[PDB]
Amino acid sequence: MINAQLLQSMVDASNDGIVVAEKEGDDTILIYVNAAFEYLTGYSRDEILYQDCRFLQGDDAASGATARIRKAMAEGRPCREVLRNYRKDGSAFWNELSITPVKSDFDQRTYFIGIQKDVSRQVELERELAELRAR
Amino acid sequence: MINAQLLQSMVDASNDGIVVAEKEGDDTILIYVNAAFEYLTGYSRDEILYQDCRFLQGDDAASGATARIRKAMAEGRPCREVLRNYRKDGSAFWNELSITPVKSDFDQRTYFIGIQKDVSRQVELERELAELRAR
Ligand code: NI
């Protein structure tokens, strides 16, 4: 079996962003982010934490597309969505987000694990590909 | 701050494969794999563990990266390599593998963290693109 420090290093090594949020009312707030999430978003740890992750969505709220996510979180189901998000510097990316409910023995709190991934390149590739297929 | 159970949930939730290996002679053997690594490779934990991970490489001896990885592991450097691997069922996939040395302050032994990303899709998209551009 594997100890806590190794688990930390497994998260720290990970390519995808990983985060944990605890529920605060009908919102969540980030309590942990890994290094890859910092790099992905352009924000430092200290800028990100203790806030709901929707700030990444920017000043726009899409069409409250997060409907599916809020449905799933409320219901205690995982989900995955691709969302528009914006780095610190304003540059936009497509973020493939997988959210996973956690059941906590230790306290009474509700936690969620998020795994996040830049999929811009792949979105663009599918687009370029469909364009050439159309020629 | 973050506890051990949630770290385990972060690794369990991970989309990429995560694994820990030990040195044994001039081999390394897996001692932990997450669920995603099962899915990725098609093998169960009990089939995988306690073996050097090169069996995934199949009948296809690469050279190139293997040397590079041995070099890097010996030297105690993290390293990253793309390599063809084969699931249980024979189907091939492109694995972006990053290996990270860590020393356990618990038992003073050095452990290797492996992160495995399936990058088949991107690779195939670039392939399909380069083919249509060739038309
Ligand atoms: Ni042995």
Author numbering:
A (entry chain B), B (entry chain A): 1 to 135
Publication excerpt:
By using a flavin transferase and carving a flavinylation motif in target proteins, we demonstrate that “dissociable” flavoproteins can be turned into covalent flavoproteins. Specifically, four different flavin mononucleotide-containing proteins were engineered to undergo covalent flavinylation: a light-oxygen-voltage domain protein, a mini singlet oxygen generator, a nitroreductase, and an old yellow enzyme-type ene reductase. The crystal structures of the designed covalent flavoproteins confirmed the designed threonyl-phosphate linkage. The elucidated crystal structures confirm that the covalent attachment does not significantly perturb the binding and microenvironment of the redox active part of the flavin cofactor.
The six preceding residues of the motif were subsequently chosen by established rational protein engineering considerations such as to minimize the structural change at a position, e.g., retaining a glycine at position 65 when compatible with the motif, mutating to an alanine whenever in doubt (e.g., D62A, not D62ILVF), and minimizing hydrophobic exposure at the surface (e.g., Q63S, not Q63T, which would introduce a water-exposed hydrophobic methyl group). This resulted in two PpSB1-LOV variants, each with six point mutations, which are further referred to as PpSB1-LOV-F1 (D60D + R61A + D62A + Q63S + L64G + G65A + R66T) and PpSB1-LOV-F2 (L64D + G65G + R66A + A67S + R68G + I69A + R70T). To gain insight into the structural consequences of the covalent tethering and the introduced mutations, we determined the crystal structure of PpSB1-LOV-F1. Residues 61–63 are in a loop, and residues 64–66 are part of an α-helix similar to other LOV domain proteins. The isoalloxazine and ribityl moieties of FMN have the same interactions with the protein side chains. The phosphate atom, however, has a different position, 1.9 Å away toward Thr66, to which it is covalently attached, by a changed angle of C4′–C5′–O5′. From the interactions with guanidino groups of Arg54, Arg61, Arg66, and Arg77 in wild-type PpSB1-LOV, only Arg54 and Arg70 are retained due to the mutations. Variant F1 displays the fastest dark recovery, accelerating from almost 1 day (1150 min) for wild-type PpSB1-LOV to about 5 min in the case of PpSB1-LOV-F1. Interestingly, PpSB1-LOV-F1 and -F2, both containing covalent FMN, exhibited a quantum yield 3.5 times and 2 times higher than that of the wild-type LOV protein, respectively. The effect was largest for PpSB1-LOV-F1, which displayed an apparent melting temperature (Tm) that was 10.5 °C higher when compared with that of the wild-type LOV protein.
